[PDB]
């Protein structure tokens, strides 16, 4: 089982196949660092079957994709939701794919507050910063106006592969 | 673990226990954590004592670690609405919501035993509450309104400017009975009335 | 702990406690979560005060975080069906279902103490309810009928039209006693009747 | 909490509580889950009220999620054996077994408050029963007998055919008070007397 | 809570009682829980007090029960038959396992059931697991069979069936409707609704 | 080592769906089909299925990866292929769907849960309706049956013996 | 099962239990661990015994492992405020908090039975309390104030300087009744009054 | 379940239960574990009974597996302080702290039923107590003083030397009712009436 | 798998991806020791995606970084908090980087008090010492005043990649 | 693998005490010292310590094996050396006891427990007094301090910074 993921890593294919945590994000950023060192002009394919996960873990993966010399193809296999939708849509323009029966979900961040009323206010201050920046980035990726992103993302919004192409999450549907 | 005793007059023999007797003399005891049950129990008590005689005083003994906030303001609004005056006494401790309740006593009638301590700090949330940011954005707004309300009603009864309260309640502030008098939370520190 | 007190007239001596005494003045306390028990106990109290005397008002005090939905509409329907007027009073907080019950008081007799907060949000489901899609489609349909029934009955008692209620309860909406009068949930804010 | 109140007459001072007062006026409250205990409690209440006066009506208020099947049929057989009429009232919900008991009141005395909901669904089993297949064949057969009894006794009282009941309860069916009268489960929707 | 009290009044005095005291007043015992050691003694004491208060009048046992242990069955059973007073049994809803044996042990002609009651008959089961040396389990296994054949011959005695038949009907559980329980010999009459 | 036989079988282009269908098994299996297509895009891949079912989302990663592969995907139902396993069997390459003789097929409609607010539950329910329409359409394609019969049979679990599964269209052949 | 017994006089037949009879003769029992429940129950009893008659002594039997701090000082300040004198009597044990109380009985009426032991130690915190350092530094400061309030009130009542208490309480210090007398914690060791 | 009964006289009718009647005849029951609660109940019972009438005997029935140490010594010192004599009777068992109470009854009024057993062993600690060595050195010393106080107060009522108690309690020592009399813990073994 | 991180050690790259505990800390000091032995002039690049952790564990890594012969480059990917912020700021000056959307969290130490009144007194003595020492050190890394480290750190201060660069935690932001 | 780094360092004669000192780390650790002295008995062994303390029995296993080894043992206090960590760092070969600059050293007296009968506990308590005396004597030999100061400072936890530790005698040098 990890013998397949290594045989595929030699062919420049990597998976984001679970929930996005520091651990999957770090094994993944390391895999992109290695793969750009072996060859910095061949693309990397990142297949995504993910329900979401930490925004902080996803910015490591997201920043690492972008600084890569080479292109990152993203493929939506089955489902890429929330932070998975973010990383699919962050793939290099023109090289974001959706399989035909994949599903894309977009929604706003979730979290918790705890502590004193002064600590919670700080927590909320970051809630707003984080919310505005993630919609801006979704806005850049999809071509939609920021106003529609904030609006559609108020509660879970599902897209089929076909509607995901209209919205701007992907560039092609593989056949 | 609590005796009952028996009193007598030309009229009849009465069996009561120590808190009933205390209720008989218009003393309410607030000595558990202020939760929602506790709070109803104390309004019910305030209102009945106001019904039985609105021109005779109500006394609230306070040895309490505080409690919820909507439960705080309920007891507080009742304290202030009832026609009878309210004398508050801090035995041992009055912290958090209970320290505001001590201060909201009718003026001149706030006291504390000598080794009582009064703690004041800003509302905290010991659990975690979870949701969409839109939901937590709303709770955080109410949690801040809760803090400034605790600070302006504290300011109203202590005479401090509310901006001082907010700086003092940023971190916990412990006060000895006397420090509480200077701060403005109580008016008098009981002298021991013992001949020995 | 909850004391008993003793009252007297030439007829006899009566031992009662703070909640019976409130009931003796046709006052019901709604201060726990509206669950199925809570609902049955409150209808039984309402119906009894209707039988003892239908021409005098019943008053419901509310310090409640809300409760179940079928439980709400039972209490609601009993409140309207009873011949007697119902004064509703919110001390501290009336949220979710409880908020609807405050507004469902008979007009002119809905009030709240000044530091009360009122929260309104649309039915949620804390649990998970599991099933074949056929079955969840049915519950999902009823959950939506329950939501609109909360929104049209609020519209009836507040004067807002239903369409705003739905915009307003999409995310939770906290209102202070004063905001709660302008909205139309209550009719008056109780002034502190205390001399000080 | 649940307070008690005190009543007074030229005869004596009587202290009682809200459920005692309701029972004194021949009202039984079925407002929890129908289990074996609750059911025995109700049968004893029914039989006792039949003893004090069989020519006067008994009323059962219902805000119940329903309950076991043999528990239902004890309560049901008891309601029908007693000579005194039974008025049923659905205050919040009468679901599953309880919806059958609402319908089983004596005709013309079955009612609901306006916003009450009625649920009808066929016997389920939330647990799991395991055994040799020979054991499970027997139980599976009785679950079918129990299903078809609910469908035939609901029919006797709603006036529908058992085949209609059996299809309406294939999947759960929620009904508003007025729709419960149309269906035949109750006779009237109570209007506010205020 | 769930069970109110009521008041009866006469020229002698005012009596406060509740639904089970009123029923006990009329010589009705309720057997409506699982028969454990507690339930059984509570029921024997009730049977014996009623035999003392008046041995010439009937006792009624209302039964809505899923059964219980074996030695608790045989205690309750033995008391029903020892007491001089006649025992009328009535099944509402259910009488299963051990409870079905006691429904049948009422005095003949006076065992009855409401029409939608179901009656269940099966052989003793042991849901626990009991462990030991093979020598001890050989003994336990032996007594467990004595229990089965004792349940089978006393069932036979009151129904009029033969134990070799009882033993076949109970190899697997046998559910009986009120009518089927009359034909089997467990009850005598099915109450018709008197509305 | 159990994974020692599965890897030697990988060299024979045999792959297994032997557990409940979750993201983890789906991700390994989508990986394997990619590899086997990279090694050789003209030899078939054989997919043995003994599964009780699992996540639709994970099943559609697998299904699309089957369909888009260059080579054919033969599917074999050994023991039991139920729910999403039933879908993936029937989704094999036409002519190359096998049932072993005493295998069983189970077909039924989707299960899930609802949770959240009244507005959140409304959305969940919208997807119930789509997903169920979209899954019945695809089972109707595989088997050739009418949508109207797929929906009616799938309401409550319908079991098939290897033979009944062949008359229905889930498979094309029974192996002997 | 704690028996009840019956007393009789020309006036009436009275049923009471051992703790009621002890209370009737003004003996309060402090024989559990001093938590906030316990402390309120004892403060109430003290205040009640002062109301029935302040010119009679009150006795506190002590067989207690001690307990929380703010509960100690609540009880302490009451005992000193009340007008009535207080007899403290140690049966079995008075440890930590409980031993401050034994010493704080009014002078001459502090006693212990012969195989009674008295244990003395400085406040301990068995839990772990957590936070930002800023908060623990605050908590820490009060824990030391509490420590030195124990050293100073014991010294007032044993006649020692606080600086000696602080040394003796660095590590636990067990005292026999006689050694507790020598220390100044009690005034007499009871002699057995048997005619055998 | 424990019945209540009704006794009657020309003055009035009294309802009580079997332990109230036993208390009414000056019989205290010590039939549980001696923990701090149990000890406080018995001290109140003993002190009350001394108040109702100091010139009459108190009897302590004992079928108790023992209990804490400071709860033994409160009970013991109360028993010895009260003016009334205390008769002790061992019904079933009196072990550990409880055998010390059997033996501490007033001389001549210590008895046991014939099949009662008496167990004597030196203090044990079923828990663990943790700490700095300086703190464990103190507890360990108090624990040794406790052992020797049990050995010397037993020595006071049995007539054995304290040094033998210490040899005998090193490991548990179970005694029959008769053997308890020779050891000096009880004075008579009750003859069946 | 584990081999992606090992191939990266060959390139003189190491990860701090989890909470900083004695276990990550020790393996990390060992790794820096080996890498200084293999070559004592080539950089060590230390990537940080860490929520924070133990100071004592963290001060092992810090002491080993500073004494190592070669320089230690620090890169903040996604999130560097608490000891993560300290170890990022402690990298060799001029060679401290933040990826564009990483965040840095700085705040004061957390712990517990427990035990006797006298033991806690000892505990609180170390709280003050520790805090004053950790603040002096952040002030050296950032160049800010001790005045501002203590005050900003009283409750959590979040910095975005740019805010951090002005404050002095890093020297650059990658593109 | 983490263990692959710890072996690459064993070849360089570096071993770590990176955790609590229990029997297992103590046995792996004595074994590492026996190996390293069998390979070459004239080259140093460097013992890095970042440890909170632990069992004295397991810790005297490590101490004796350090002192009986033919080669010297240099000790490094990384980040933290407390309790038995403090003892083992300070028991390093005189002159080769090092502190990293921001390490901390903790010194205090034994902790432990008592249980069982009154006689058993007496026995537990004798060993306490012995064990307490033997450790202070050893720490007094290591540090140069009088026994009287070791006992006074160790009653309650006494913390040292690397610099304070050098004045006190736990180490010989601060690395820079
Ligand atoms: C994931 O941790 C956290 C991440 C945070 C964080 O990251 C970044 C970083 C760079 C970033 N660049 C950009 C452009 C955005 C952006 C970002 F956003 N930036 C600010 N502050 C954070 C707080 C966290 O919290 C941590 C305590 C431990 N903790 C974890 C999870 C908790 C929780 C609670 C409830 C659910 C749930 N359903 O209820 C899940 C988790 C509760 C407490
Ligand atoms: C597998 O998760 C989920 C998958 C979903 C999903 O997938 C796809 C993807 C591509 C797809 N292409 C095609 C043609 C269909 C199709 C698809 F359908 N598409 C839409 N929406 C989904 C929601 C999910 O759920 C998530 C919320 C949280 N959540 C609460 C309770 C849950 C639960 C689950 C099982 C049981 C049980 N036995 O009680 C109870 C509860 C599960 C999850
Ligand atoms: C990290 O351990 C501890 C480290 C300490 C320590 O380290 C150093 C070393 C070199 C250092 N150079 C510099 C400049 C600072 C500096 C340093 F500071 N120097 C002084 N004294 C310490 C006490 C500790 O505590 C240990 C007791 C056992 N213990 C109790 C409770 C614990 C706890 C409790 C609650 C949470 C939580 N969320 O509640 C986490 C832990 C953890 C451990
Ligand atoms: C560490 O085992 C034990 C080691 C012992 C031991 O070893 C040696 C050997 C050579 C030695 N040369 C020198 C100079 C000292 C020296 C040494 F000392 N020599 C003497 N006697 C010992 C007792 C032990 O104890 C075992 C009881 C059972 N038992 C275990 C742990 C317990 C415990 C309790 C509380 C914590 C609390 N926080 O943690 C942890 C453990 C409590 C009871």
Q: Whose CA is nearest to atom 29 of ligand 1?
A: A112
Neighboring chains of I (3 or more beta-carbon pairs < 8 A): A, G, J
Shortest-distance ligand to the CA of residue F133:
2
Given B96, B124, B134, B196, the catalytic residue: B96
Backbone angles phi, psi at J87, to 5 degrees: -65, -45
The residue count of chain H comes to 193
What lies within 8 Å, CB to CB, of B93 at 6+ separation is B63, B64, B65, B116, B117, B118, B119, G70, G74
Shortest Cα distance, chain E CAs vs residue D115, angstroms: 24
Q: Whose CA is nearest to atom 42 of ligand 3?
A: I111
Contact in structure between F114 and F125 (CB atoms under 8 Å): yes
H-chain residue closest to J157, CA distance: H132
Q: C-alpha distances in angstroms, D149 versus D100, D122, D144, D163, E180?
A: 11, 10, 9, 12, 16
G-chain residue closest to H138, CA distance: G172
Q: Whose CA is nearest to atom 1 of ligand 3?
A: I54
Backbone angles phi, psi at J100, to 5 degrees: -75, 155
Q: C-alpha distances in angstroms, J146 versus D42, J94, J136, J166, J168?
A: 85, 18, 9, 16, 11
> CA F27, CA F19: separation in Å to the nearest integer?
13
Q: Is residue G194 part of a domain?
A: no
Q: Which H/E stretch holds residue D84?
A: none
Query: Taking CB atoms and an 8 Å cutoff, what residues of chain G touch B92?
Result: 39, 70-71, 73-75, 77
Write the DSSP symbol of residue G192. P
Instruction: Among J80, J99, J106, name the best residue to mutate to test ligand 3's pocket (greatest count of ligand atoms within 8 A of Cβ).
Output: J80
> CA H53, CA I141: separation in Å to the nearest integer?
84
> CA E189, CA E182: separation in Å to the nearest integer?
6
Ligand 4 atom closest to Cα of residue J131: 15
Q: Which SS3 state, helix, strand or coil, does residue E27 take?
A: coil
- Dump strand ranges (E) for chain F: 14-17, 45-51, 73-82, 97-99, 104-107, 111-117, 158-161, 173-174
User: Exposed, middle or buried, I89 (CB in 10 Å: 0-12/13-18/19+)?
Assistant: buried
How far is ligand 3, taken at its centre, from the CA of residue I123, in Å? 10
Does I78 reach chain A within 8 Å, measured CB to CB?
Answer: yes
Query: Taking CB atoms and an 8 Å cutoff, what residues of chain J touch H131?
Result: 111-113
The CA-CA-CA angle for residues F105, F110, F115, to 5°, reads 150
The number of distinct structural domains making up chain J is: 1
Instruction: Among J113, J120, J138, name the best residue to mutate to test ligand 4's pocket (greatest count of ligand atoms within 8 A of Cβ).
Output: J113
C-chain residue closest to B72, CA distance: C92
**Beta carbons of J6 and I30 less than 8 Å apart:** yes
Backbone angles phi, psi at H100, to 5 degrees: -65, -35
Instruction: Give the domain range for residue A117.
Output: 1-173
Neighbour tally for A131: CB within 10 Å: 18
Write the DSSP symbol of residue B19. H
The CATH number for E102's domain is: 3.90.226.10
User: Exposed, middle or buried, A10 (CB in 10 Å: 0-12/13-18/19+)?
Assistant: exposed
**Beta carbons of H143 and J109 less than 8 Å apart:** no
Write the DSSP symbol of residue A11. T
**Beta carbons of C133 and F128 less than 8 Å apart:** yes
Burial letters D145-157, b for 16+ CB under 10 A, else e: ebbebbbebbbeb
The number of distinct structural domains making up chain H is: 1
**Beta carbons of F119 and C125 less than 8 Å apart:** no
Q: Is residue B129 part of a domain?
A: yes
Q: Is residue D57 part of a domain?
A: yes
Helix residue ranges, H only, chain C: 18-24, 36-52, 69-81, 97-103, 133-158, 162-169, 177-183
- Dump strand ranges (E) for chain E: 6-9, 14-17, 28-31, 59-65, 87-96, 111-113, 118-121, 174-177, 189-190
User: Exposed, middle or buried, G105 (CB in 10 Å: 0-12/13-18/19+)?
Assistant: buried
* F32 closest CB neighbour out of A4, A11, A47: A4
Number of CB pairs, chain D paired with chain E, less than 8 A apart:
103
The residues lining ligand 2, judged by C-beta closer than 6 Å to any ligand atom, are A 78-79, 101, 103, 158; C 128, 130; F 55-57, 60, 111-113, 115, 127, 131, 134
Backbone angles phi, psi at C126, to 5 degrees: -75, -35
Write the DSSP symbol of residue C33. -
3+ Cβ–Cβ pairs closer than 8 Å linking F and E: no
Q: C-alpha distances in angstroms, F145 versus F141, H95, J89?
A: 7, 83, 79
Q: Is residue D194 part of a domain?
A: no
Q: C-alpha distances in angstroms, F11 versus A5, A6, F1, F46, H181?
A: 16, 16, 16, 12, 89
Q: Is residue C194 part of a domain?
A: no
User: Exposed, middle or buried, J167 (CB in 10 Å: 0-12/13-18/19+)?
Assistant: exposed
Instruction: Give the domain range for residue H40.
Output: 5-189
Query: Taking CB atoms and an 8 Å cutoff, what residues of chain I touch J9?
Result: 30, 33-34
Write the DSSP symbol of residue G106. P
Q: Is residue B194 part of a domain?
A: no
Shortest Cα distance, chain A CAs vs residue F58, angstroms: 6
Number of CB pairs, chain A paired with chain F, less than 8 A apart:
73
CA end-to-end span of chain F: 30
What value does the CA radius of gyration of chain I take, rounded to a whole number of Å?
16
How far is ligand 1, taken at its centre, from the CA of residue B55, in Å? 57
Q: Is residue E136 part of a domain?
A: yes
3+ Cβ–Cβ pairs closer than 8 Å linking B and G: yes
Write the DSSP symbol of residue I53. B
Using DSSP bridges, classify how beta strands J158-161 and J104-107 pair: parallel, antiparallel or unpaired.
antiparallel
Q: Which SS3 state, helix, strand or coil, does residue I143 take?
A: coil
I-chain residue closest to G121, CA distance: I116
Shortest Cα distance, chain J CAs vs residue I63, angstroms: 6
Closest by CA position to H46, among listed E80, A113, G22: G22
The CATH number for A50's domain is: 3.90.226.10
Q: C-alpha distances in angstroms, A78 versus A48, A100, F19, F23, F70?
A: 8, 9, 18, 9, 19
Contact in structure between J51 and J21 (CB atoms under 8 Å): yes
Shortest-distance ligand to the CA of residue J141:
4
Shortest-distance ligand to the CA of residue F127:
2
Q: C-alpha distances in angstroms, H130 versus G126, I114, I119, J112?
A: 12, 14, 15, 5
3+ Cβ–Cβ pairs closer than 8 Å linking D and H: no
Q: Whose CA is nearest to atom 1 of ligand 2?
A: F55
**Beta carbons of C20 and D5 less than 8 Å apart:** yes
Does J18 reach chain I within 8 Å, measured CB to CB?
Answer: yes
> CA E8, CA E16: separation in Å to the nearest integer?
6
Complete DSSP assignment for E69-105: -HHHHHHHHHHHHHSSS-EEEEEEEEEETHHHHHHHH
F-chain residue closest to C135, CA distance: F111
Contact in structure between J35 and J2 (CB atoms under 8 Å): no
How far is ligand 1, taken at its centre, from the CA of residue A111, in Å? 7
Q: Is residue G42 part of a domain?
A: yes
Q: Which SS3 state, helix, strand or coil, does residue I11 take?
A: coil
Q: Largest alpha-carbon pair distance within chain G? A: 69
């Amino acid at each position: 089982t990890d013998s397949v993921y290594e045989r595929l890593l030699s062919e420049r294919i990597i998976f984001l196949g679970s929930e996005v945590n520091d651990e999957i994000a770090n094994r993944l950023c390391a895999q992109i660092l290695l793969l750009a060192a072996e060859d910095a002009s061949k693309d990397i394919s990142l297949y995504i079957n993910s329900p979401g996960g930490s925004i902080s873990a996803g910015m490591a993966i997201y920043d690492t994709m972008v600084l890569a010399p080479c292109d990152i193809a993203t493929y939506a296999m089955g489902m890429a939701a929330s932070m998975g939708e973010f990383l699919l849509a962050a793939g290099t323009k023109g090289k974001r794919y959706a399989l035909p029966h994949a599903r894309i979900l977009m929604h706003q961040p979730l979290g918790g507050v705890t502590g004193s009323a002064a600590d919670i206010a700080i927590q909320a201050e970051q809630f707003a910063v984080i919310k505005k920046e993630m919609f801006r980035l979704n806005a850049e990726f999809t071509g939609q106006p920021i106003e529609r992103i904030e609006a559609d993302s108020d509660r879970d919004r599902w897209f089929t592969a076909a509607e995901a192409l209209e919205y701007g999450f992907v560039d092609h549907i593989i056949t | 673990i609590l005796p009952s005793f028996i009193e007598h007059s030309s009229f009849g023999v009465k069996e009561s226990n120590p808190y009933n007797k205390l209720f008989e003399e218009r003393i309410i005891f607030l000595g558990v954590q202020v939760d929602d049950a506790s709070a109803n129990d104390i309004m019910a008590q305030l209102l009945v004592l106001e019904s039985l005689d609105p021109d005779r005083d109500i006394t609230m003994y306070i040895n309490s670690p505080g409690g919820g906030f909507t439960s705080l303001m309920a007891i507080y609004d009742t304290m202030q609405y009832v026609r009878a005056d309210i004398q508050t006494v801090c035995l041992g401790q009055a912290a958090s919501a209970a320290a505001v309740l001590l201060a909201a006593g009718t003026p001149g009638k706030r006291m504390a035993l000598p080794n009582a301590r009064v703690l004041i700090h800003q509302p905290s949330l010991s659990g975690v509450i979870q949701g969409q940011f839109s939901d937590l954005e709303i709770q955080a707004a109410e949690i801040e309104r809760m803090r400034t309300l605790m600070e302006t009603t504290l300011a109203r009864h202590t005479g401090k400017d509310a901006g001082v309260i907010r700086k003092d309640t940023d971190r916990d502030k412990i006060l000895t009975a006397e420090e509480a008098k200077d701060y403005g939370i109580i008016d008098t520190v009981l002298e021991y009335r013992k001949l020995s």
